[PDB]
Amino acid sequence: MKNMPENHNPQANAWTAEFPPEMSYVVFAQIGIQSKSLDHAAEHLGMMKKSFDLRTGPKHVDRALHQGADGYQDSIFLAYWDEPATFKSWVADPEVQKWWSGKKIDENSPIGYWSEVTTIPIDHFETLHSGENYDNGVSHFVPIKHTEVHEYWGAMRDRMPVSASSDLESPLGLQLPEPIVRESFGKRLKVTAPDNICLIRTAQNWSKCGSGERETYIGLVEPTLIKANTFLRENASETGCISSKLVYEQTHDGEIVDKSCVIGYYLSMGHLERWTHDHPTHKAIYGTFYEMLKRHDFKTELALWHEVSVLQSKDIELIYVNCHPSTGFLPFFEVTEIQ
Ligand code: HEM
Numbered sequence: 001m002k003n004m005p006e007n008h009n010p011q012a013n014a015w016t017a018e019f020p021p022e023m024s025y026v027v028f029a030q031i032g033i034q035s036k037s038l039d040h041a042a043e044h045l046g047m048m049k050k051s052f053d054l055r056t057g058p059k060h061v062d063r064a065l066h067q068g069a070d071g072y073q074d075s076i077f078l079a080y081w082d083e084p085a086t087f088k089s090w091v092a093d094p095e096v097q098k099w100w101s102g103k104k105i106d107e108n109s110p111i112g113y114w115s116e117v118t119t120i121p122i123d124h125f126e127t128l129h130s131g132e133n134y135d136n137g138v139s140h141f142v143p144i145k146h147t148e149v150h151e152y153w154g155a156m157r158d159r160m161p162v163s164a165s166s167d168l169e170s171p172l173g174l175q176l177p178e179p180i181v182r183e184s185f186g187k188r189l190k191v192t193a194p195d196n197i198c199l200i201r202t203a204q205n206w207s208k209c210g211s212g213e214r215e216t217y218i219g220l221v222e223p224t225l226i227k228a229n230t231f232l233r234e235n236a237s238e239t240g241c242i243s244s245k246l247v248y249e250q251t252h253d254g255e256i257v258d259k260s261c262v263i264g265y266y267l268s269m270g271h272l273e274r275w276t277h278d279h280p281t282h283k284a285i286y287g288t289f290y291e292m293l294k295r296h297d298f299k300t301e302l303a304l305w306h307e308v309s310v311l312q313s314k315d316i317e318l319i320y321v322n323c324h325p326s327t328g329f330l331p332f333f334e335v336t337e338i339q
Contacts, residue, residue, distance in 0.1 A: 001149060001158055002154070002157075002158055002163070002164070003152065003153070003154025003155065003157060003158050004149070004152060004154075004155070004158060005152055008148065008151075008152060010148060010150060010151035010152075011151065012130070012151060013131075013146060014128055014129060014130060014146070014147055014150040014151070015128070015129040015131070015132050015133075015139075015144040015145060015146055015147065016126065016127055016128055016129065016144060016145060016147040016149070016150075016159060017126075017127040017138050017139060017142045017143070017144050018142070018143055018144065018145045019122050019125075019142055020142075020143075023082050023083075023122055023142075024121070024122055025082075025083075025084050025119050025120060025121060025122060026080060026081070026082060026119075026120045026122065026125060026138060026309075027058075027079075027080065027081040027082075027083075027084055027087045027117065027118070027119050027120070028078070028079075028080055028117075028118045028120055028199075028201075028307075028309070029058070029077075029078075029079045029080075029081075029087070029115065029116075029117045029118075030076055030077070030078055030079075030115065030116045030117075030263065031048065031076065031077045031079065031114075031115045032066070032074040032075065032076045032077075032112075032113070032114045032115070033045060033048075033074070033075045033076075033111055033112070033113060034068070034072055034073070034074050034075075034111060034112035034113070034114065034322075034323055034324065034327065035072070035073060035075070035110065035111045035112070036071050036072055036073070036110070038073065038075065038254075040110045040111050041075050041111055044099060044104065044111065044113075045075055045254070047095075047098060047099050048077060048099060049252070050095070051090075051093070051095050051096045051099075052077070052079065054090060054093055054095065054096070056086050056087075056089045056090035056093060057079075057090055058079035058080050058081050058087075058090075059080050059081055059082055059140065059141040060079075060080045060137070060138075060140040060141055061077055061078065061079040061080070062077070062078040062079075062137075062249055063075075063076065063077055063078075063249065063250040063251070063252070063254065064076045064078060064247035064248060064249045064250060064261070065247060065248050065250055065254075065256065066245050066246070066247040068245075068324065068326070068327070069324060069326045070324065070326075072112075072324045074114075074245070074247075074327075075254075076247060078137075078201075078263075080137065080138060080140075080141070082141065082142075084119050087117075099113075101113070101115070101188075101319055101321065101338075102114075102188060102319070102321025102322065105321045105322050106322075107186035107187070107322065108186070109322055111322070112185075112320070112321060112322040112323040112324065112327070113319075113320075113321040113322065113323070114319060114320045114321065114323050114327055114328060115317070115318075115319050116316065116317070116318050116319075116328060116329070117316065117317045118199060118309065118311055118315055118316045118317075119315050119316075120309040120311070120315065121162075121315070122161075123160075123161040123162040124160065124162050124309055124310045124311070125160065125307070125308070125309045126156065126159035126160040126161075126307075126308055127139070127144070127159075127305065127306065127307045127308075128147075128150055128155075128156070128159065128305060128306055129144055129303075129304075129305040130300075130302070130303055130304040130305065131303050132144065132146075133205075133303050133305070135205075136203065136205070136303070136305040137201060137203070137305065137307050138307060139305070147159070153273070153276075153277045154273075156269070156273070156308055157269060157273065160269075160308070160310065162310070168196055168198075168268060168269050168270070168310050169196065169268055169270060170194065170196055170197075170240075170267045170268035170270070170271070171194075175237050175238075175240065175267075176236045176237050176240060176241075176242065176267060176332060177237060177332070178236070178237060179236055179326065179331030179332065180331050180332070181325050181331070182325045182330050182331070182335060183325075184320060184322075184323050184324065184325045184327070184330050185322055185323070185324070185325075186322055187321075187322070187337060188319070188320075188321045188322075188337060188338040189319070189320045189321075189323075189330065189335050189336065189337060189338070190317075190318060190319055190320075190335070190336045190337075190338050191318040191320070191328075191329040191330065191332070191333055191334065191335050191336075192313060192318075192333060192334045192336065193265075193311070193313050193316050193318060193329060193333060194267075194313060194333065195311075195312045195313050196268050196269075196310055196311070196312070197242065197265055197266065197267060197268070197310070197311050197316070198265070198266045198267075198268055198269040198271070198272050198308065198309070198310050198311070199263075199264070199265050199266075199308070199309045199310075199311060199316075200262070200263070200264050200266070200272060200306055200307070200308045200309075201261055201262070201263050201306060201307045202261060202262050202264075202304075202305075202306035203259070203260070203261035203262075203304065203305050203306065204217075204221075204222075204225065204259065204260045204261065204302070204303075204304060205258070205259045205302070205303040205304070205305075206218075206258045206259070206301075206302050206303075207257060207258040207259060208301045208303065209258075209301045209302055210301065212295075212296060213292075213296055213300065213301055213302055214258070216292045216295055216296065217292065217302055220288045220291060220292055221285065221288045221289055221292055222260075224281070224284045224285045224288055225246070225260075225262070225285055226246065227281060227284070228262075228281040228282055228284075228285055229244050229245075229246040229262055231279075231281050232244035232264060232275070232281075236331075236332070239266075239271065239275050239279075240266050240267035240268065240271030240272075240274075240275070241264055241265070241266055241267075241271070241275070242264075242265040242266065242267065242329060242332055243263075243264065243265045243328050243329060244262060244263070244264040244265075245262065245263045245264070246260060246261075246262050247260065247261060247262075247263065248260045249261070265329070268310075269308070269310055272308075319338070
């Protein structure tokens, strides 16, 4: 509790995941089919859906839809394992090998494939939940406990165990350049990330909200979350944000539900902290959130949560097959053709 204010007394409760002692890693896989029309993605999305039901499949998996650049959409699965060896065995399963790593994607194909697989060391991971909710990413399969370590600037860092001994910094005084345009269509590309990047999934869940809370969330809060994410996508150098996606979650059948989340990679957790604490875009969000809590008596069915991880280069595998150049990590760092 290095950053906790003196006599800290949070006003709102919060919960955080408490991992069992035999758990050393969480595998968080984002797998995306990229298309201009969802009909072209239908066949791929069927094969992958069945693969998640294998005995070696993820402990939990969400679907989400992302509207990306230039009319291209990403149909994404967000899949979790609590054992890397089980995930490795799922990949090697022959049904998965039919489509893994864009194997079905030709160089003249109308769809793209991408995957960003992060193997998260547990001491480099933390979660926060506005309520005792068992349907928030890892809280589907990991118990959560009440925490006082929240509601101050630095609490995220303090909730992450390794920050007791590590600064988690990126190189001093250096920034992301302007994004570079790659010739990524028709190619199988691999990107190598630097050490200590920070990945956040921060989520909004209003499916249990009544008439009043839903109108206030859609009308007041969501517009500024969108503005936040748009700003982040367009100001990589200034913010340190490598990649930011606002996605809307879907049923197994792909119908949109009243849930969204932002998935962002940052050059370091300090970059994420500086944006969150000092930028007006989020200051705005936090301000329309308290203005919504003032319109409904600070009694909320809205549910928020986030998962934050700090990754070494070798913890994350970034593969883009026949993808648009602005996808994910493609505009930054070292790209390599896969043979
Ligand atoms: C691009 C979207 C967002 C990003 C990247 C983001 C990021 C963060 C981060 C990193 C923190 C922890 C800061 C720290 O502990 O030092 C935080 C805290 C917080 N955020 Fe956001 N957030 C986003 C959207 C939202 C939304 C949509 C809401 C509410 C509707 C929100 C409300 C809050 C609140 C209330 C806290 C305080 C949590 C606590 O009790 O510690 N944020 N956010």
